[PDB]
Amino acid sequence: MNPKRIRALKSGKQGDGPVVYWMSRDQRAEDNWALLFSRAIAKEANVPVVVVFCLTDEFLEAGIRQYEFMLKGLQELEVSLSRKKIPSFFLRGDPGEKISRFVKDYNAGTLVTDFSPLRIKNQWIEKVISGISIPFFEVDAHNVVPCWEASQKHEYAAHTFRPKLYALLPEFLEEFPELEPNSVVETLSDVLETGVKALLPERALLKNKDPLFEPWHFEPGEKAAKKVMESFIADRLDSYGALRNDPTKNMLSNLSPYLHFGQISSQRVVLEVEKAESNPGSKKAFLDEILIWKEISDNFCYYNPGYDGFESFPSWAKESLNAHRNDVRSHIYTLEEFEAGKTHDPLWNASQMELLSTGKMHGYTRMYWAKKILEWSESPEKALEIAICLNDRYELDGRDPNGYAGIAWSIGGVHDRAWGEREVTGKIRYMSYEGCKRKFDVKLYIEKYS
């Protein structure tokens, strides 16, 4: 195991109790580096390993679609973890008070947690460090190359982050070792019942008092991601590089909700893809999305504290947008109109309806749905707020570094370039509705999501 995957957050007095793994971003038993790093340090200490998950108070900021998808996987994870004699403990409340009290009550020896560059995670780490006296480590279990090792600074483009991540693939793209089993605070069903009950008033309903979310598209679970990845390699991998810009076809891997919650490892997906025989043009297209653009999103959120603000934009984009702030917008809609899909664009309305109904809108339409927010907002800062709101609320893969890096590109050209100067939008890359008609059947995408 590579010691570059682990980092030291706080040196402390080594206890004699079980090494506690604070699982958060990577909710899986297989291909979890942090779970394997926590098992080896537990073996060297002749002490059992225990995992802990914190159901935070901010779960009401999302919806039932994210609460049910994440809990259903944990109901499956508790079984698999018990098959290796690893008990799981699910605390409900603030991590700063729950982790520090659990470590003290159980005489923990070492604390381990997965890596997440989001601001809400660094908020929890700041609180737990002030109330613990044992060693505290963090492990990058999400990225193939550790986020602090792929680059020591923010990469302004994909062509400059590609040769750094690819040159480090021969060292970090490796097979996973077996999760050795151990030598020897309520039911998750009750947390789902009471949690959904508090989320029913804010459930996305239609006019007929019926909900919008269709929860039969992506079944959750670690075994569920096993079948989705196998179905993509066998059926959709050969045709990926040619129909990934066509939202009328379901030609994507559909692994993003399993990737966000950590129910599947991107390293495991790359391993099976790299050994699969298919079109080299389609293989390069998928690896560039799951390796480059995915791990550069963690690069954007790690080295830019204001990743969700106007200040993280490139210097050319801030000057371009500022030079067009006072331009008369074509039309201005409110958050309630963008949320209900009540605009003058049927293609945009169809992209919002797919976001409302499935919780996973096509990748190409995500670029159109977010850029049109900037064209129909009072200011770039308002377009950022509206885009991040509708993304984090309805996307099953929402509240992920991929979203903020994808939103900062549509509204601020992050990891892009300067194009022709237009009004309102400035030099940000513009995508027209007529340009989408010559790209795919827009009429089929609209009629599909009435």
Ligand SMILES: Cc1cc2nc3c(=O)[nH]c(=O)nc-3n(C[C@H](O)[C@H](O)[C@H](O)COP(=O)(O)OP(=O)(O)OC[C@H]3O[C@@H](n4cnc5c(N)ncnc54)[C@H](O)[C@@H]3O)c2cc1C
């Ligand atoms: C406005 C906007 C919002 C987005 N919101 C999210 C979000 O909330 N959560 C989220 O995980 N992704 C988000 N993305 C990135 C991207 O759209 C989705 O990751 C992708 O559509 C996921 O669906 P898929 O797995 O079926 O596509 P696939 O083509 O099968 O992609 C496979 C995986 O590669 C990664 N990937 C692919 N494309 C990108 C990309 N452009 N950026 C980063 N990673 C990528 C993803 O991990 C993805 O799951 C957003 C993009 C935009 C433009």
